[PDB]
Amino acid sequence: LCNKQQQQGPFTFANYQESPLNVSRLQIKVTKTTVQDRGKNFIIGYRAYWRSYCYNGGSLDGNTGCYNSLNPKPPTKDELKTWGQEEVCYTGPEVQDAWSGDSSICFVDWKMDNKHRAKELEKRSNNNHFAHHTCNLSWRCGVTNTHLEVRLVASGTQPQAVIVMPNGTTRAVSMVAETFWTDGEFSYLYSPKVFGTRAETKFIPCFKEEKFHCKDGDNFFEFPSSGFICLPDACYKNEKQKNNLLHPGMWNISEKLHAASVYDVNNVIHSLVYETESLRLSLAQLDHRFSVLTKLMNKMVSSLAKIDDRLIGALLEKPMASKFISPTKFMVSPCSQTIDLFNFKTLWLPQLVAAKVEGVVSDEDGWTFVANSKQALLDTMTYTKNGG
Amino acid sequence: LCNKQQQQGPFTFANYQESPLNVSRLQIKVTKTTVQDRGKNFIIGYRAYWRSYCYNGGSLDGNTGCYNSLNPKPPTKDELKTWGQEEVCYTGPEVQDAWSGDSSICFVDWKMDNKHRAKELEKRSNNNHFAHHTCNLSWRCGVTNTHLEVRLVASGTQPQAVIVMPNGTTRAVSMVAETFWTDGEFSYLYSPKVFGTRAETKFIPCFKEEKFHCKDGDNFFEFPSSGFICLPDACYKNEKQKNNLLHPGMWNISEKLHAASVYDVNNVIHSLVYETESLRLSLAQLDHRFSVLTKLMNKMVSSLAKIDDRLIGALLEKPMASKFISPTKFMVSPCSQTIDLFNFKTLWLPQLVAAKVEGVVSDEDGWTFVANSKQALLDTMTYTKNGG
Amino acid sequence: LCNKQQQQGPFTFANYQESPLNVSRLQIKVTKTTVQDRGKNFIIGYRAYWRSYCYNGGSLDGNTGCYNSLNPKPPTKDELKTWGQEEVCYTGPEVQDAWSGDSSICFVDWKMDNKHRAKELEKRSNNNHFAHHTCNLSWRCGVTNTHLEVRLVASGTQPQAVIVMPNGTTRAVSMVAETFWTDGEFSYLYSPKVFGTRAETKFIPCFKEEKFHCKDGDNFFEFPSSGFICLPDACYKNEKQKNNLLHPGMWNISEKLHAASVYDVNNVIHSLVYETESLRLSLAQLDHRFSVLTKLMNKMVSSLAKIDDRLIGALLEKPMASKFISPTKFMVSPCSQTIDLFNFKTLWLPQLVAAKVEGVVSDEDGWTFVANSKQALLDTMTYTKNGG
C-alpha cells in the first residue's frame, strides 16, 4: 500500500538538451588555379672539360709550370634538345700526352663531336717534355629526361608558376616559350604542353568552426580569412572576392624542402591515440545512454502492456497476448499520409581520407641527377694522374 | 475541448530506417612471409692506400715526375670476419720519405700486419732526392658491426629476401651461406642465424568496403584484389590463392629511400582535423537524437503514469505513487526465460592504433658508416702534404 | 481472437548493459621544465687560410718544393661577437705571387684587418722564381646569426639543457655565461636572455587506459610509470614524485636527427583509414539502434495514444485529439522541482588536435650554414691554380 495522504511537489520532468555546436558543413565555391603538366617535360644537361697546359723549360725558365683549369661548357638550347632526344651528350676530344706540336690541341674551339651516353673526366697532367709544351684534356657530360613539378607562389596578387630550387631560390617559368637557363656546368630546359596557369570553378567541402578546415581531393588545408590561399600545387580563391585584389595566404617553401623527423611523425601518432581515446569515451557515453533507455523502455512497456495485452506482440512482430503474473513477470498466449514523431535524418558518417605525400625537393629526379653529377666531379678530382 | 466532429487522415507513424553500409569486419586468413633476423648480423669493412712513387732525375729526364694512385684493397671474407670480431682493421705500413734504396718499399706485397682501431690516410708526396726515387705510402681502414634489415621483393612470384642499397639498387641475399660482396674500397658480410624466409599462418583484421583496409600489428595496408601483397618487411598471401601463382602487389622502393616533407606531415595533420570535425558532426547529431528521445519519452511517461501511478516509482527505482495536479505537474507519495525487445549487442569500439616508423635507408647505421667514410676520404684528399 | 487458454513463461524483459571501459579523463598536475629562448641567439663563424710557401732552387737542391697547408683560425669570442654584430668577418691579406723579398709575408702574424661580407679562398700555388721563395696566401671566412633550439636530456636525474649536434653528440649549455666553443674552422657562441631552465606548474589532460596518453599544447606523449618523462623541448614530472629522485623517461635523440620516410607517413595514413572504417562501424551500429528505438516507440505510442487521445498532440506540440480507425491508422481532430528519468550529462566531444612538426637537426639554419661552408671548401679545393 501507499500513503496517498502526503504529497510532495509539484514536480516536472527535466528534459535533456544537447550542447549547441558551431561546426557546420559547407560547400565553398572557389576558383582553383593549377599549373599541372604531365610527362617527361624537363631536360638537364651538364658538360665541362679539365685542361692541363704545361711547359717544361727547366727550373730557370719563369714559364716552367702548369696552367690547369676546370671549365664549364653548358650546352646550348638546341644542343640540350638533341641530347635529351638522343639520350646522348656531345663533347670535344680526349687529349692525353699531346706535346710540343700536338700541344696546340689545348686551344682549338673543338666543335664538340665526341658522342657519349655518359662520360666522366680524368684529372691527368704531365710536364715531362723538356723545352716543350704538354697538353691534357678530359671531358665530362651527362643528360637526363625527367618530370618537373611546377609550384605556385604569389609575390603579391595573381599566383605565378615557378620552379623551386633545392636551396630555396625560386625561378619564374616563362609563359611564352620553353623556359631555359644555364648555371655553371648545367643547362635546364622545361617544355610543357601548354603555357600559363589553368583555372577551374569547383566546390570544395569544408567544416566551419572563424575557422574553415577544408578538403580538395588529397589536399587538406585551413581556408583563410580573406578566402584566398595558395598551396604548392594549387591556389584556392573564394568568389565573392573574385573581383577583389588580395594577397593570398602563402605556403612556406621550407616545408617542401626540409624533411619531417621520425619524432614528428611519432608525435602525430600520439595525437591520434589521444583522439582515439577521446573518441572511445564519447562512444562509451552514448552506449551508456542506450542502456539507460532500454531499462526505462522495458519498465514503460511492462506498465503499458498490462493495459494493452497485444502490445508486446506488436513489439515482437508476432501475434500474441500477454498476461502478467507479477509486476515484472508475464505469460504469453498465441494469437495515405504519415506522421513523424522523430524527424530523424540520415546520419552523417565521416568519409575516408588519404592525404597526399610527395617528399622533398632534393629527392626529385632532376635535382638528384644534379647532386650526383656534382658528387662525381668531387670524386674524380681528388688527385692528379700522370698522363705519361 | 476538442472538435471530435472533423477528422483528418488516416495517418501512420513514419519509422526511421538506418542507411545501409557495406563496411564489414573480416578476419582474413593469410600466409605471412618474413625475413626477420635480430642482432648485429652485418659487418662492413673498408681499406685503401695512397701511393706516391716519384723520381727526380731533373727536368731533362723524361722519367722525372710522380706516379700517384688511390688503390682500394677491400678485405677478404675471413679478414672482414676477424676485423668485426676484433673491431680492428689491418693494413700495410706507413711509408714516408723512403728514397732510393727504401723506395723499393712502394711495391712489396706488404702482407697487412699494422693493426688499427681506425685509420685515415695522409695524401703526402715529395720528389726532392735527385737521381733517385721517392716513396710515400699511407693507409686507411675501418670496420663496423651493425644490424641489417632485409626486405622482400617479388620479381614475379615467390617473394625474395634482398638488401636495398641507398641508390635504390637491390642485392639478393644468398640462401646458402653468409652473403658476402665487395664494392671498391668496401666489403660487406651479412651473417644471419637462419637462412631463407619464414612463413606463418595467421588471421589479420580488415574492413571490407572491393576495398580491404587491413592491419597486422603496427603494419597497415590496403589488401589488393588478388589477395597477395608484399610490404618491405613482410608479404601477405591469401589462402584461397594459396595454390595459385600470382605476382604480388609490390611496395615502391623509393618510399623507403626518400624522406617525407614537413608539408606532407602537416597535410596529414590537416586531414585529421577535417576528419575530427566530421566526427564531431556525427556525434552532435546523435546527441540531438538523444535529446529528442528524452523529450518524447518524458511526455509518454507523463501520459502513462496518469493511468499507472506506480510507474514513475519503478523508473526511479524508489517505491512511490504519482498523482498529477496538471497535465505536466504531479505530486509524489511514499510507498526463467527473458524477452529482448531490443536485441542490442555490445558496441564495437575502435581500438588503439600505432603505425610503424622506421626512417630512410641512408640513415641506417651501415650506410651511414659508408657515407661518413667516403666523406672522410674527400676531406683528407683536398691537398698534398710534403713528406720532406 | 487469442487463445487465453495456454500460457508460456514466466518471462522477463532482458535489459541491455553497456560494456565497462577503463578509459577515464585525467587532469594530471605536473611540473613542466623548459629551456625555451626566443630570437637570434646563436652566432657561427668560420675562418681559415690556404698557404703555399715554395722554394725553387733547382732539381739538385733538397729544399726545392712546396710546403702547403690549410690552417684553421677560428675567431675568438669577442671577434665572433663583432662579426655577428657587424655581419662581417675579418681575415688576413690576400697574397699572390709574392717572391723572394715579399715571400716573407707567409709568416707575419697578420693581425686580421681585411673585412668581408663573405670570402672563399683560392687554392693557388706557383714555384717559378729560381733561387727564390714564393708565397701564396688565400683566406676564407663566414658568419651567421640564427636561432638555436636547446633541448633537454637527463643523464640521471635533474634534466639538463644541451645543444644537439647533427652527428648525435650533445654539448652542455653553460648556466653561467654565454656558452662558447671552437671546432676546427668554426666557432659557436650561444647567448640566451636568461640562463638555466624554467619550471611551471600546470595540469595536462590525459586518458587513463596502466597507460596514460597525454597532451600539452601541440605535444602528445605517453606518460610513463614513474610520472617523469623528458621530451626534446620539455620535461614533465608528476608531483607526488616531486620529492623523489627518479631518472625520467628519455626521448631517443636519433628520432630528431633521422627523417621519416614517405612509407612511414603512408603507413600512418593507412592506420587512419583503418580507424576511420572502425569508427564508421560504431556509428552505423548506433544508427541501427536509433532505428530500432523509433520502431519500438512508434508502436508504444500507437498503443498508449488509443487510451490518451491527447498524447500524439503533446508529442507533436500541437493541440489535437487522435482516434484510431485501425490498430495502426488514426484520424486527427483539432483542439518548482524537476525529476530526471535519464540523468544525462553533456556529451564529451573529441576536441581538435594539431601535432608539432619541427623537422630534423641537420636542416637547422646553423647546421645548414656549417654544412654549406664545408661543401664550399671541398668545391674550392679541387685543383691548384697557378699564381703566376
Side-chain angles (χ1 to χ4, degrees), chain A residues 277-292:
Chain A
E277 289 281 49
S278 186
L279 183 270
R280 286 155 72 79
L281 264 195
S282 299
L283 286 181
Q285 187 160 352
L286 300 179
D287 199 20
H288 163 75
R289 292 188 174 185
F290 269 112
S291 182
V292 163

Tab-separated table of all heavy atoms in Angstrom, chain A residues 277-292:
chain	number	residue	atom	x	y	z
A	277	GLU	N	41.291	7.742	-28.015
A	277	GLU	CA	40.785	7.540	-26.663
A	277	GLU	C	39.636	8.490	-26.363
A	277	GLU	O	38.633	8.088	-25.765
A	277	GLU	CB	41.906	7.718	-25.639
A	277	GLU	CG	42.945	6.606	-25.642
A	277	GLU	CD	42.483	5.349	-24.924
A	277	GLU	OE1	41.364	4.869	-25.201
A	277	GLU	OE2	43.250	4.831	-24.089
A	278	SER	N	39.767	9.754	-26.772
A	278	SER	CA	38.677	10.710	-26.619
A	278	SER	C	37.438	10.252	-27.373
A	278	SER	O	36.313	10.387	-26.879
A	278	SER	CB	39.120	12.086	-27.110
A	278	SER	OG	38.132	13.065	-26.850
A	279	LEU	N	37.630	9.712	-28.577
A	279	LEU	CA	36.510	9.180	-29.344
A	279	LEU	C	35.861	8.005	-28.623
A	279	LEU	O	34.631	7.894	-28.587
A	279	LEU	CB	36.997	8.775	-30.738
A	279	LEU	CG	36.039	8.233	-31.803
A	279	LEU	CD1	35.938	6.718	-31.722
A	279	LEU	CD2	34.664	8.878	-31.702
A	280	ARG	N	36.670	7.126	-28.030
A	280	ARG	CA	36.115	5.967	-27.336
A	280	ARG	C	35.296	6.390	-26.124
A	280	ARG	O	34.283	5.760	-25.799
A	280	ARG	CB	37.237	5.012	-26.925
A	280	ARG	CG	37.827	4.228	-28.088
A	280	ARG	CD	39.247	3.778	-27.800
A	280	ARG	NE	39.308	2.711	-26.807
A	280	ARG	CZ	39.047	1.433	-27.067
A	280	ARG	NH1	38.697	1.063	-28.291
A	280	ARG	NH2	39.132	0.524	-26.102
A	281	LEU	N	35.719	7.457	-25.444
A	281	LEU	CA	34.944	7.993	-24.330
A	281	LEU	C	33.565	8.443	-24.794
A	281	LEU	O	32.554	8.150	-24.148
A	281	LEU	CB	35.691	9.160	-23.686
A	281	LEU	CG	36.548	8.869	-22.455
A	281	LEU	CD1	36.910	10.172	-21.758
A	281	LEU	CD2	35.824	7.934	-21.503
A	282	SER	N	33.509	9.171	-25.912
A	282	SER	CA	32.226	9.619	-26.441
A	282	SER	C	31.335	8.439	-26.805
A	282	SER	O	30.136	8.442	-26.507
A	282	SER	CB	32.447	10.516	-27.656
A	282	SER	OG	33.202	11.660	-27.305
A	283	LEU	N	31.908	7.418	-27.445
A	283	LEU	CA	31.122	6.252	-27.837
A	283	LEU	C	30.616	5.488	-26.623
A	283	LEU	O	29.470	5.024	-26.609
A	283	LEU	CB	31.955	5.339	-28.731
A	283	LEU	CG	32.163	5.835	-30.154
A	283	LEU	CD1	32.972	4.818	-30.921
A	283	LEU	CD2	30.824	6.086	-30.827
A	284	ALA	N	31.460	5.331	-25.602
A	284	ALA	CA	31.016	4.662	-24.386
A	284	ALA	C	29.893	5.440	-23.708
A	284	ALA	O	28.962	4.844	-23.160
A	284	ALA	CB	32.196	4.473	-23.434
A	285	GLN	N	29.963	6.775	-23.740
A	285	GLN	CA	28.908	7.585	-23.140
A	285	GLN	C	27.577	7.371	-23.852
A	285	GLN	O	26.535	7.231	-23.204
A	285	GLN	CB	29.300	9.064	-23.162
A	285	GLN	CG	28.337	9.978	-22.413
A	285	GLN	CD	28.963	11.307	-22.028
A	285	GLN	OE1	30.168	11.513	-22.193
A	285	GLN	NE2	28.145	12.222	-21.514
A	286	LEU	N	27.595	7.334	-25.187
A	286	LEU	CA	26.379	7.032	-25.936
A	286	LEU	C	25.915	5.600	-25.702
A	286	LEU	O	24.710	5.324	-25.749
A	286	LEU	CB	26.604	7.278	-27.427
A	286	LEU	CG	27.001	8.689	-27.868
A	286	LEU	CD1	27.210	8.738	-29.369
A	286	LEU	CD2	25.961	9.714	-27.450
A	287	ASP	N	26.847	4.677	-25.455
A	287	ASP	CA	26.468	3.302	-25.141
A	287	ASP	C	25.740	3.228	-23.807
A	287	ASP	O	24.757	2.493	-23.665
A	287	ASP	CB	27.710	2.411	-25.124
A	287	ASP	CG	27.380	0.936	-25.253
A	287	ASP	OD1	26.269	0.608	-25.723
A	287	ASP	OD2	28.233	0.102	-24.885
A	288	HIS	N	26.215	3.980	-22.816
A	288	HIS	CA	25.547	4.020	-21.521
A	288	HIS	C	24.164	4.647	-21.636
A	288	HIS	O	23.223	4.218	-20.960
A	288	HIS	CB	26.417	4.787	-20.525
A	288	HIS	CG	25.688	5.242	-19.302
A	288	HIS	ND1	25.339	4.385	-18.280
A	288	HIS	CD2	25.260	6.471	-18.926
A	288	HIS	CE1	24.720	5.065	-17.331
A	288	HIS	NE2	24.659	6.333	-17.698
A	289	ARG	N	24.025	5.664	-22.489
A	289	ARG	CA	22.719	6.273	-22.712
A	289	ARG	C	21.732	5.262	-23.281
A	289	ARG	O	20.575	5.202	-22.850
A	289	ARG	CB	22.855	7.475	-23.645
A	289	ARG	CG	23.597	8.656	-23.041
A	289	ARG	CD	23.527	9.871	-23.955
A	289	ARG	NE	24.100	11.060	-23.335
A	289	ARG	CZ	24.085	12.270	-23.885
A	289	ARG	NH1	23.527	12.460	-25.073
A	289	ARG	NH2	24.633	13.295	-23.246
A	290	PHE	N	22.174	4.454	-24.247
A	290	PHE	CA	21.297	3.435	-24.814
A	290	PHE	C	20.912	2.384	-23.781
A	290	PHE	O	19.799	1.848	-23.826
A	290	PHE	CB	21.970	2.771	-26.015
A	290	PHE	CG	21.669	3.441	-27.325
A	290	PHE	CD1	22.660	4.108	-28.020
A	290	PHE	CD2	20.398	3.392	-27.867
A	290	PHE	CE1	22.384	4.719	-29.226
A	290	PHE	CE2	20.118	4.005	-29.070
A	290	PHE	CZ	21.112	4.667	-29.749
A	291	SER	N	21.818	2.065	-22.853
A	291	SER	CA	21.485	1.123	-21.792
A	291	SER	C	20.431	1.702	-20.861
A	291	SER	O	19.507	0.997	-20.441
A	291	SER	CB	22.744	0.747	-21.010
A	291	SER	OG	22.459	-0.211	-20.009
A	292	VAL	N	20.553	2.988	-20.535
A	292	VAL	CA	19.554	3.653	-19.706
A	292	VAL	C	18.204	3.671	-20.411
A	292	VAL	O	17.157	3.452	-19.789
A	292	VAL	CB	20.032	5.072	-19.346
A	292	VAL	CG1	18.874	5.926	-18.858
A	292	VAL	CG2	21.137	4.998	-18.304
